[PDB]
Each structure stands twice: as C-alpha cells, then as structure tokens.
Amino acid sequence: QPVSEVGSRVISCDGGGGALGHPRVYINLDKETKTGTCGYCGLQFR
C-alpha cells in the first residue's frame, strides 16, 4: 500500500469504517525520520 501522509500531526486510524474495523487509535507523527505504522491496521503514516 502507498503510505498516507497528512501535513497536520496526530491522526486517527480506525482500519476503515466505524465499528467494523479495529479500535480507534491515534498514530503520532513526532518523527519524520520514520513512517507511522498503525498498531492493528498495519498502515503506515507520515
């Protein structure tokens, strides 16, 4: 998958949809040196 990127900072990943994916979690992006992989989803962020 392509790595999703947002200019903001903290983002919330639910794994797609509401109440059909993993528990809502916020992936921090304090370090631009690395991608923000989701805990359950496995989807990277930056």
Binding site: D14, G18, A19, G21, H22, P23, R24
Partner: protein, 375 residues
C-alpha cells in the same frame, strides 16, 4: 423407542404384568456440575441449554435469575418482557413435544407431524433472534443478549393468531378419541398429598388437584402484569395431566397477546458495564468500555460470595438452581434441581401392578427427559 434412547428400566415382569420397574438413570450422565465449577459464570451458561434441552430458554432464565439475586441487579423492563415472552414460546415447545411424543409412544403417529411443522416455525424465531435454531444462549445473567430485530413481532403475531386452530384440531384427534381415552384415564393416579411427599412439581401436582403454581404464587417477572388461568386437574390420571398440558398451551397463548400489547421501548442489557459488556459501537471508541469488555471476557465478573436456591415454573415443573459464589469469578458449586428427577423417582410407586404398555404410557405422562435427570 419408548426408552428415549437412554433408559434401562430393568423389571421383573410376570406373565405380562410388571412386578417392579427398576429405573437405572445415569446412562447419560455427562457429568456437568464438576465441569461447571472450573468455568466462569458467563462460560457456564450454555450447559443449561444442554440440560432440559426441549425447554432451552426457561433454563437460561432460571440461571440468570439465580445470578441476579446474588449480584443484586435488575434487568431493564423490556428485557423482562422478552424473558417472559420466550419463556412462553418455550412453554409451548415443551408442551408440544410432550403431548406429541407421548402420543407417538402409544402409536398415534400423526399428530406429531401436524405439530412439528409449527414447532419448526417457532425454531424459525430462535433462528431469527439468536442465530441458532435452538440452544439459543441468548438470555444473559445481565438480562438478554442482542436486541431482537424489528421485523419480528408482527411475524410472531401472524403465527400466534393462527396457531389455535392447530392446537384445536389436535384436540379433536385426541380428547374425544375414546380409544385414546380408554388407554389413559385410569392411570396412573397419585394421591394429592403423596405427590407432595415425593415433591412432585408442576403439572404432576395440578393433576391431583392441588392449587399450587409458582407463577401465581411467587412470581418472578412481569407475571405480576400478565393474566392467565391455571388449569387444575382432578382425578390425577394421565388424562387430566394431558388436558393440563393442552390448556396450559392455550393459556400461554393468552400470555403472548398481553406481552405483544405491552412491550416497552428501552434498553435490554443492564446499564452496569461491570456486568454487561459494552455495545460494540462504543467499545471500539472509548477506553473504559474496551477495558470492561476485555475483563468481562478474560476474567469475567466476580460475584459476592453467597448461596441461593432459585426456582421457576419450567414447563416440566419448577427448575431449581442452587449455587454458591465463593466471591471468585468461578462459581464454587452449582447443584441443579431437575424436576424430572423426583418424578422418575416416584414412578415405581405410581406404576406397580400395571400392564406393561401402561407403564410405557405412564413414563410419558411423567414427560421426563433423561438429559435433565442425569444432569
């Protein structure tokens, strides 16, 4: 076939009269109570369906009461209305199965097939709300599991209005059918007091005319708010018990009306998340929700240490749960009263000297189910 797959009634018959029937239960003692002790409360619940399996809901209701008293907690009213409603559809299930197979034992054959169509239509309901055709682990200690689907109640209505013709036609094949009368009318009478000494329960009492009945006597749910006529028997012969079965069917069919007409909106699980797991939309988006979810399924809820005996009007008789919370999440001991057990104990007194066919019919009036006896 008359031994219900799991009975070994050895008997020292004469020429063709019995001299003493000698029941030997335990042929299906799966060993339940030992198992229950090792499993937490929520994980113990299914065993109860596996008990009096013909009457699968009322057992669950018996348990959920048995815990709620210990847990000191009260279901939201709608849940109580479901709990009584399916308590009653199940009332009809056991009575159908009872009157029917009791007929099949004496060769009527037909009424069977006329009814299991209906009984199948009832399993369409367990199918619809619980997702299982039977053994619907649906009643919960906290109240009830998922809410029932919108499309259901009219569907129950449409059936219930038309069921009565069916039960009636059954009654035309039986109650007047004087062959059937002669086979079961002078057997097997039990003295009204002598019942009480043996602790007969439910219909086996009412057949001998004693007034007692737990729903009227020590009501546990909205039975305060339903009105129905208990049918007392008289002679105590199998025939009276039969008419009690039928009439109680009609009366349950009365209850369904009232429950349909007063079925309040509101929640169904108890609010107390410490006991009732959070709804999925919620547990996935707030911390405490997820945590109580997690612990409710991992360790399970604790119960205050204590002991009790609840009992309710299960279709065969009162169903009785004696259990003792140690305070841990695993109940310490959970003796399960089985109404059938007492009956079958009383059988040999009730059946001395009777013809060998009549002992077969009289096993059936006892309407016993061995899965419940062997617990």
């Amino acid at each position: 076939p008359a031994a219900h797959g799991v009975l070994r009634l050895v008997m020292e018959l004469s020429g063709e009269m019995v001299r003493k029937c000698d029941p030997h239960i335990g042929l299906l003692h799966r060993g339940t109570e030992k198992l229950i002790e090792y499993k937490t409360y929520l994980q113990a619940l299914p065993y109860f369906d596996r008990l009096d399996y013909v009457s699968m809901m009322c057992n669950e209701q018996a348990y959920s009461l048995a815990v709620e008293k210990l847990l000191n907690i009260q279901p939201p009213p709608r849940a109580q209305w479901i709990r009584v409603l399916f308590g009653e559809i199940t009332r009809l299930l056991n009575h159908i199965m009872a009157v029917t197979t009791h007929a099949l034992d004496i060769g009527a054959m037909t009424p069977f097939f006329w009814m299991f169509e209906e009984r199948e239509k009832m399993f369409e309901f367990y199918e619809r709300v619980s997702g299982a055709r039977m053994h619907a682990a649906y009643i919960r200690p906290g109240g009830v599991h998922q809410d029932l689907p919108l499309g259901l109640l009219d569907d129950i209505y449409e059936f219930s209005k038309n069921f009565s013709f069916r039960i009636d036609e059954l009654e035309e094949m039986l109650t007047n059918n004087r062959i059937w009368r002669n086979r079961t009318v002078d057997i097997g009478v039990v003295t009204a007091e002598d019942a009480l000494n043996y602790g007969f329960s439910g219909v086996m009492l009412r057949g001998s005319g004693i007034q007692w009945d737990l729903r009227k006597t020590q009501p546990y749910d909205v039975y305060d708010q339903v009105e129905f006529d208990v049918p007392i028997g008289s002679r105590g012969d199998c025939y009276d018990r039969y008419l009690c079965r039928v009439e109680e069917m009609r009366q349950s069919l009365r209850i369904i009306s009232q429950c349909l007409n007063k079925m309040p909106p509101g929640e169904i699980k108890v609010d107390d998340a410490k006991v009732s797991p959070p709804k999925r939309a919620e547990m996935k988006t707030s911390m405490e929700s997820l945590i109580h979810h997690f612990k409710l399924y991992t360790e399970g809820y604790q119960v205050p240490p204590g002991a009790t005996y609840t009992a309710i009007e299960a279709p065969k008789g009162e169903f009785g749960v004696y259990l003792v919370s140690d305070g841990s999440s695993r109940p310490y001991r959970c003796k399960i009263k089985a109404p059938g057990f007492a009956h079958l104990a009383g059988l040999d007194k009730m059946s001395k000297g009777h013809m060998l066919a009549d002992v077969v019919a009289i096993i059936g009036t006892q309407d016993i189910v061995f899965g419940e006896v062997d617990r």
